[PDB]
Amino acid sequence: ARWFPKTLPCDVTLDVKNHVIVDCTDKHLTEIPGGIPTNTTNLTLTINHIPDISPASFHRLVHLVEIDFRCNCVPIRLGSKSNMCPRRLQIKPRSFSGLTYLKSLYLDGNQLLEIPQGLPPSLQLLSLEANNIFSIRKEQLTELANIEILYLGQNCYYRNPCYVSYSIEKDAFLNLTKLKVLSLKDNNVTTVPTVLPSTLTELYLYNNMIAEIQEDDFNNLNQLQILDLSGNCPRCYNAPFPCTPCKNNSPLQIPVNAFDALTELKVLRLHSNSLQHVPPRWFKNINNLQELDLSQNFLAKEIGDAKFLHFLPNLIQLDLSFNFELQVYRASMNLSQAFSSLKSLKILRIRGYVFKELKSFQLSPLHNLQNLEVLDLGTNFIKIANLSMFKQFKRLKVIDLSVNKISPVLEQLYYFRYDKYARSCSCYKYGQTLDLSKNSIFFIKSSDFQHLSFLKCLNLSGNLISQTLNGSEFQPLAELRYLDFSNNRLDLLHSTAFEELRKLEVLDISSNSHYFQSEGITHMLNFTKNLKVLQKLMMNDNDISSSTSRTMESESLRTLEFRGNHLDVLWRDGDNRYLQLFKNLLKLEELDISKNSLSFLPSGVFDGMPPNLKNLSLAKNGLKSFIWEKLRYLKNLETLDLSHNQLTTVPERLSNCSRSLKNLILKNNQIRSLTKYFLQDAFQLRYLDLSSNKIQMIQKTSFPENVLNNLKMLLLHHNRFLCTCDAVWFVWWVQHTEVTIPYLATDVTCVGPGAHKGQSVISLDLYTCEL
Amino acid sequence: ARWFPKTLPCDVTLDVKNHVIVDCTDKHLTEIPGGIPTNTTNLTLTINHIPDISPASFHRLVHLVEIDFRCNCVPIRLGSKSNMCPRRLQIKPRSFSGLTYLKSLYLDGNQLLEIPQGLPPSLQLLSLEANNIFSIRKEQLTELANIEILYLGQNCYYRNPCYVSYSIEKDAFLNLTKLKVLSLKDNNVTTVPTVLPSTLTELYLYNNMIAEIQEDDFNNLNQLQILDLSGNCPRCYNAPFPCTPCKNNSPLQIPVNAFDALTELKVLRLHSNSLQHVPPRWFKNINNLQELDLSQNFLAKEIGDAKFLHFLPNLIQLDLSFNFELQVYRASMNLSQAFSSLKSLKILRIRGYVFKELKSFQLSPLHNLQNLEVLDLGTNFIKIANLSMFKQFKRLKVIDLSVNKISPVLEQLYYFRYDKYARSCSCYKYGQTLDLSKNSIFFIKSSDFQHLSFLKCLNLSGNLISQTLNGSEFQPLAELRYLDFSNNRLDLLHSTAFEELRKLEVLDISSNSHYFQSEGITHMLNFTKNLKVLQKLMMNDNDISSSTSRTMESESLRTLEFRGNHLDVLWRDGDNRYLQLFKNLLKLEELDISKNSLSFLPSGVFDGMPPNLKNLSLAKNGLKSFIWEKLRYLKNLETLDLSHNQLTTVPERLSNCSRSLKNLILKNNQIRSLTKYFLQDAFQLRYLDLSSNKIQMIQKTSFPENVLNNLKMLLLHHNRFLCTCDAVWFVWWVQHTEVTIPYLATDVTCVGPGAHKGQSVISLDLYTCEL
Ligand SMILES: *[C@@H]1O[C@H](CO)[C@@H](O[C@@H]2O[C@H](CO)[C@@H](O)[C@H](O)[C@H]2NC(C)=O)[C@H](O)[C@H]1NC(C)=O
Ligand SMILES: *[C@@H]1O[C@H](CO)[C@@H](O[C@@H]2O[C@H](CO)[C@@H](O)[C@H](O)[C@H]2NC(C)=O)[C@H](O)[C@H]1NC(C)=O
Ligand SMILES: COCCOc1nc(N)c2[nH]c(=O)n(Cc3ccccc3)c2n1
Ligand SMILES: COCCOc1nc(N)c2[nH]c(=O)n(Cc3ccccc3)c2n1
Ligand SMILES: *[C@@H]1O[C@H](CO)[C@@H](O)[C@H](O)[C@H]1NC(C)=O
Ligand SMILES: *[C@@H]1O[C@H](CO)[C@@H](O)[C@H](O)[C@H]1NC(C)=O
Ligand SMILES: *[C@@H]1O[C@H](CO)[C@@H](O)[C@H](O)[C@H]1NC(C)=O
Ligand SMILES: *[C@@H]1O[C@H](CO)[C@@H](O)[C@H](O)[C@H]1NC(C)=O
Ligand SMILES: *[C@@H]1O[C@H](CO)[C@@H](O)[C@H](O)[C@H]1NC(C)=O
Ligand SMILES: *[C@@H]1O[C@H](CO)[C@@H](O)[C@H](O)[C@H]1NC(C)=O
Ligand SMILES: *[C@@H]1O[C@H](CO)[C@@H](O)[C@H](O)[C@H]1NC(C)=O
Ligand SMILES: *[C@@H]1O[C@H](CO)[C@@H](O)[C@H](O)[C@H]1NC(C)=O
Numbered sequence A, B: 001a002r003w004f005p006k007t008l009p010c011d012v013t014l015d016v017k018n019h020v021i022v023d024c025t026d027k028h029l030t031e032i033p034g035g036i037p038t039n040t041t042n043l044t045l046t047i048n049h050i051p052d053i054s055p056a057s058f059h060r061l062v063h064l065v066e067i068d069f070r071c072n073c074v075p076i077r078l079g080s081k082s083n084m085c086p087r088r089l090q091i092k093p094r095s096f097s098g099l100t101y102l103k104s105l106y107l108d109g110n111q112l113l114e115i116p117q118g119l120p121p122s123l124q125l126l127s128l129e130a131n132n133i134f135s136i137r138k139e140q141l142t143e144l145a146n147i148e149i150l151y152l153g154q155n156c157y158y159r160n161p162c163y164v165s166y167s168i169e170k171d172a173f174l175n176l177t178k179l180k181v182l183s184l185k186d187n188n189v190t191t192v193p194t195v196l197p198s199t200l201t202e203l204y205l206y207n208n209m210i211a212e213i214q215e216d217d218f219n220n221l222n223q224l225q226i227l228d229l230s231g232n233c234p235r236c237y238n239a240p241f242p243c244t245p246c247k248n249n250s251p252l253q254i255p256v257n258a259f260d261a262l263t264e265l266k267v268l269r270l271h272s273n274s275l276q277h278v279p280p281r282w283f284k285n286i287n288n289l290q291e292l293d294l295s296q297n298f299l300a301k302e303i304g305d306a307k308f309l310h311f312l313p314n315l316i317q318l319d320l321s322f323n324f325e326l327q328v329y330r331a332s333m334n335l336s337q338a339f340s341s342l343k344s345l346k347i348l349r350i351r352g353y354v355f356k357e358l359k360s361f362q363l364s365p366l367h368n369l370q371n372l373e374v375l376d377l378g379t380n381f382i383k384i385a386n387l388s389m390f391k392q393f394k395r396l397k398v399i400d401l402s403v404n405k406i407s408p409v410l411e412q413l414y415y416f417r418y419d420k421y422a423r424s425c426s427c428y429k430y431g432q433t434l435d436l437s438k439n440s441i442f443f444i445k446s447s448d449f450q451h452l453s454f455l456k457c458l459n460l461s462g463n464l465i466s467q468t469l470n471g472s473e474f475q476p477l478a479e480l481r482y483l484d485f486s487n488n489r490l491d492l493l494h495s496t497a498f499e500e501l502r503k504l505e506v507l508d509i510s511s512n513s514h515y516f517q518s519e520g521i522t523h524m525l526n527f528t529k530n531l532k533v534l535q536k537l538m539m540n541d542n543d544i545s546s547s548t549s550r551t552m553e554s555e556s557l558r559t560l561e562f563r564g565n566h567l568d569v570l571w572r573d574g575d576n577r578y579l580q581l582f583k584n585l586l587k588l589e590e591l592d593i594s595k596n597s598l599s600f601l602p603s604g605v606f607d608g609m610p611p612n613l614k615n616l617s618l619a620k621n622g623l624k625s626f627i628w629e630k631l632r633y634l635k636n637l638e639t640l641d642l643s644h645n646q647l648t649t650v651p652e653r654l655s656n657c658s659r660s661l662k663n664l665i666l667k668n669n670q671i672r673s674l675t676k677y678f679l680q681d682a683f684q685l686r687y688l689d690l691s692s693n694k695i696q697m698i699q700k701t702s703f704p705e706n707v708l709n710n711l712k713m714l715l716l717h718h719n720r721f722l723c724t725c726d727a728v729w730f731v732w733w734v735q736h737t738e739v740t741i742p743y744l745a746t747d748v749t750c751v752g753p754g755a756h757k758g759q760s761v762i763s764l765d766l767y768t769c770e771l
């Protein structure tokens, strides 16, 4: 099909407008490759080991609007220790001055000592994060007259130390009259640099050594929308990065008038500034403020008073998390009445207040916040809460009591990571959610959920629930669509478990292995019959090796996850009793029986499958053999996942095994060669992964072109390809096909013979085979 | 050193007396190898694919006392499905008649249709388990006149069906006048064969279809010591193998006088015979009975009466497990007073009686059993037990309440596997043990252990204990030496946790990841300081990535297991705070820090190790690099485990890195070659494992003979050895060395060049390299 093989080790993409995008991310390059198109608008060379840039680098590439050249020499402590960068990136004079249309230049993570000079006046975005530039001088910024976005952070901090204070000359940035975004985070800065251009919308000064704000510091910044001063005078208790507090337990000192000019301010972040008081006067001339982060201060007392809230009627989010007093376990949470001023508030987070008992009235300041959607009281060591108090919170989307000690999306390292916005080189959608995960609930009964019939998802994941559910425990939860009961100890003595949840669409009972791990106890896996609208059942990692019921039954269920169990034991060769375990799941479309130690599949398994099975996984089973002909029984099979097993062969004729099969995943097996007519007449096939096997040769008979050319994708990487004259067809076909084959640059490689060892097949000249 | 290389693919061992033991177990043989020594006494050829035996097989081997030729054609359902046996083993005439001294012949698992004829009269043991011989005729046993031990079981059952009843001619075995042991288990037998020779000591008739015992079936068996009739009329409820009960819920019917002749009987197994009553009259003329198994019957009621116990004053073990009535949850356990007649009883097991509440007086029948050592009341769904009742059981070695629902060694498939004696092809030693594992204990306090100060080991593994231990919870356990607290939710707010256990030698807090998995909670890992005689601490799989204490301290601790945590995060490059975490464990000799995602080791780690570290594991870390010179800091290092990582190199000179190092494990890495002088002057080295790497060449310089010849073991298997003329030394050395190198038969193999591919280096003739 293709007249000229793409030999360039980079992905190439058009988009008309008006971009030619060349992506060489992580291609182990030591040089900018030759042959990059002349029309290239966006060139990405991130994560390679290109030791320099010169006028030759970009000579022909005059239409470049963006160079992303990040992490070609990452600082020692941030980067790989197996392949350390020997010496800082070298940038020779006039390497960029030619690039008349260059709007964006990323040079992060290259150990640069200075702001590269000779940059073109078209430049809008310059990024220099994670270099060794720790002294900014007005003279070096004159080239940046038209610059709008300037990232200078992470040049002086514990992962990349400069061993001195950061220095910024007086008025360094003032004459940058178009600068909108300035980031000087993670830099050992000691004072807000001044005067700043008034054109700024976003100023990031967090994680620095600024002990005081002068009353003038933000005087002219009347366009500023985001200000972040977090992590100056940090709260260091249980900090999981090195942490130096301001001396004398001092807070970051901010004059009461410091923010007066900031009338456009939308976001103010004062996380981890050791604040003991939040003076109302701060917010006098800011009315448009939407997001305020006061997490990680010492505001426990202030939470009970908080007069400043009366000045914040447009505030959408408020974070007061991790303000607890050291060594104190409060009896209760004292929320000021001032919380009732927050007419616009959608999200309130008060993790880590740390208190024993939550009572209904303590939340009364929140009762009339009409727009409140999220109340997050996680990680509080709450021991006692009458859950019925949430009858007054039907309007909320999420009530998060996660990680508490109750008994009758944000990343998991969010509040405690160093820089949550550092650049590297779920049942909420069902409706109202009560997250009780990771608590101490050992016993449940109906009245625990009294007045909570509005709930659509309940998360009980990671409690201690160890009882014989009989259908009486959740009786009030008449609307519940999702129940996450994972990480408990479900005891399925009774097949009536869960049947009171009459609207239940999704049930997770994964990781309830405790009672399935024990011998000669009853287990009623036919409990599914009673749940008439159940769509998805997850029963992963339960170690299930025995069952009292021979069959699971459902008229509704579409997806069953049954991974990490012992069907190998249930289907012990010679025992027929459980071969139809899934057969009466009549609408079942997706079955995951990966990680079940199925070395082999007894005969009967495929006949036993329910008639509409579409997506079957047998991954990670140690399968050593597989009667491919038995796929004939699975008349609606579309996706078959046999990844990570020990198969040594493919079928003689795939078309003779299944007429429906579209996606066949055979990665990570022991396949040494393909059968002579493997894919012959397999017209349905659209996706074939044969990566990470031990294949030497592929001949045309096995891979007919009328089948290959309808493939959306064909994965061949990490095999043992022998590039002799017998491979002439494969090598040609690979070089000239339209079919998408990932990693042709990286990992489609001859292992021999000698001459061609280690070489990419895409680059292979086999002219000697046609003399 | 050796003049003639051992080329035979079998392990060969002398023992003077007077045995030449040739072991070819699992060597993928399709033929009996040539060159087996003529003096061979014991030849084992188990698990190979040798399709026949003939007079050539053993022609020269006239001193053979034993042939173990098991599983060269295992029945379809018991054996491998990837390599099924095509056709039953063929035994030609007169293959054994020469073997005049043959005392033992195992031919199990070969699909034999008949009892091999022409066997020598010296034969004492014949084993034919898992063949297809399901009709025994007196005529075929005339060859076995001197036989003592005859195993005929597993020839007709669900894993290897014959589709008919087993047949034994009248008096078939009678004229075998030396037969001591007869096993006809798992055979679809319908009646006790008669008459049996009176010389029998052991008779195994379990797992069969015998509905009745005739009163004379065991009349003449006055030497019989073991009788097993289990699994005839089985109790089939929650059976995890296919199970057909006798009709009408009938028991195995046994006349009251059936055992009268059995005066020597020591062991009687009546497991899973659906017995409702145990008539005293059975035991009238058996006084020497030591072991009785009555598990898996319907003896719940009978346990409360049990008059038969008065006839059993010499009984050592009694098993009454899994006698519960279906659908009944008794309030209490009713043990007859008759239990007090059991003067000799050491072991009593009553698992699966199934009851709610255990009370002190219910065990009073056991109060004066002076020899009682084990009381096992596991798997009973006990909800309530005042543990102080065990103040009356100081003399016991083990009190097992494992797998219950309390809240104030036997294999895990023991009671419910088909044939617990089927042949395939711990803190008890500290003193008194109370096993509370896998219960529902959510909260502990001191009084829970009142009157239990005698305890040496307590197993709390797998409870729900989720509290902030402060040193008050275990105060009475003044003698406790071992605490298994694994699989709980330890909350280490307080460094005083566990300090009341003043005699504690071993603490397991593994798999208490719950509170270490959460961010910005306190964790006092310095709790170790208070435990003055603590020798071993296990804190595996806790996911530990943060710690409030910088250092762990102990004057006593010798062994710390810290595997499955996140030291990679604690030692994040640039953070120095935790680099001395283990340093003040002054007597630490063994440290396991495998599975900690340590891609690299930051500098400081080895300087941070405590000074007497001997045994270090860094296995399974994905280590991509390792500064070998840093081993100089570990001045007492003896064993270093770097298995399962990604190391590509060894040190230039191992001796220059450590003077103390004796055992170096480098298996499962990516090592492609050895340094020129790798082991030069490494005089301390005794064990080197380089198996499963990618090594092509080993030269003499790297492996000097003065170092090699002090090695206890040297592992080289599963590498990528190239057998060219450059390998001449290695191939010679390997063939001629005394040094133990396992798997020379199986997996020390040339990968090339072409000519020698797949060939063992032991067998390699490289004469062309000296032509
Ligand atoms: C932040 O700047 C301070 C100086 O303000 C650096 O601290 C100096 O570091 C050297 C070498 O570690 C010491 O000998 C000096 O005495 C230090 N001075 C002070 C005042 O502490 C600090 O290392 C810088 N931080 C980073 C991460 O580079
Ligand atoms: C044990 O013997 C019984 C009969 O004594 C076998 O059962 C017969 O099996 C055949 C073929 O399956 C059937 O046609 C008959 O219905 C069965 N007869 C009866 C009376 O049940 C049984 O197959 C044998 N078991 C094994 C495991 O070999
Ligand atoms: C030892 O086996 C006893 C019967 O099986 C079995 N399996 C469970 N999962 C139970 N949970 C459980 O509580 N019991 C006890 C029980 C027994 C009968 C009636 C009511 C409660 C259980 N018994
Ligand atoms: C969220 O920040 C909590 C501070 O740390 C922290 N860590 C634990 N592991 C506790 N267990 C625990 O019960 N608490 C609450 C507490 C706090 C102070 C005094 C006594 C009890 C815990 N608090
Ligand atoms: C190309 O560069 C422009 C300007 O920097 C940018 O807006 C656009 O999103 C880029 N496209 C990419 C990386 O695909
Ligand atoms: C429930 O909470 C757990 C544990 O915190 C989390 O993994 C899971 O995503 C939640 N489940 C759902 C369905 O939201
Ligand atoms: C479920 O299990 C078995 C039948 O397989 C039976 O004992 C029980 O009554 C059944 N109950 C339901 C709801 O299917
Ligand atoms: C050798 O055979 C004899 C007779 O069967 C037996 O007693 C002995 O255990 C055997 N020795 C070994 C090591 O297998
Ligand atoms: C215990 O068991 C028997 C039933 O076999 C009954 O007769 C006896 O009286 C019971 N005793 C007590 C104290 O429960
Ligand atoms: C437990 O029994 C003991 C008698 O050994 C007694 O001291 C104690 O009061 C009982 N405890 C409870 C909680 O019933
Ligand atoms: C405690 O019990 C568990 C079984 O529940 C077992 O794995 C462990 O070995 C026991 N602990 C000790 C120290 O024997
Ligand atoms: C330890 O906890 C117990 C009970 O929770 C309490 O009696 C005691 O005061 C605690 N010890 C200390 C020093 O707080």
Ligand SMILES: *[C@@H]1O[C@H](CO)[C@@H](O)[C@H](O)[C@H]1NC(C)=O
Pocket: B495, B496, B524, B526, B527, B528, B529, B530, B548, B549
């Ligand atoms: C553990 O560390 C804390 C400070 O981090 C200290 O208060 C405490 O006493 C230490 N405990 C021991 C037992 O050394």
Ligand SMILES: *[C@@H]1O[C@H](CO)[C@@H](O)[C@H](O)[C@H]1NC(C)=O
Pocket: B632, B655, B656, B657, B658
């Ligand atoms: C390593 O070898 C060099 C050269 O013999 C020597 O100077 C140095 O002391 C040696 N170090 C150790 C730890 O043996």
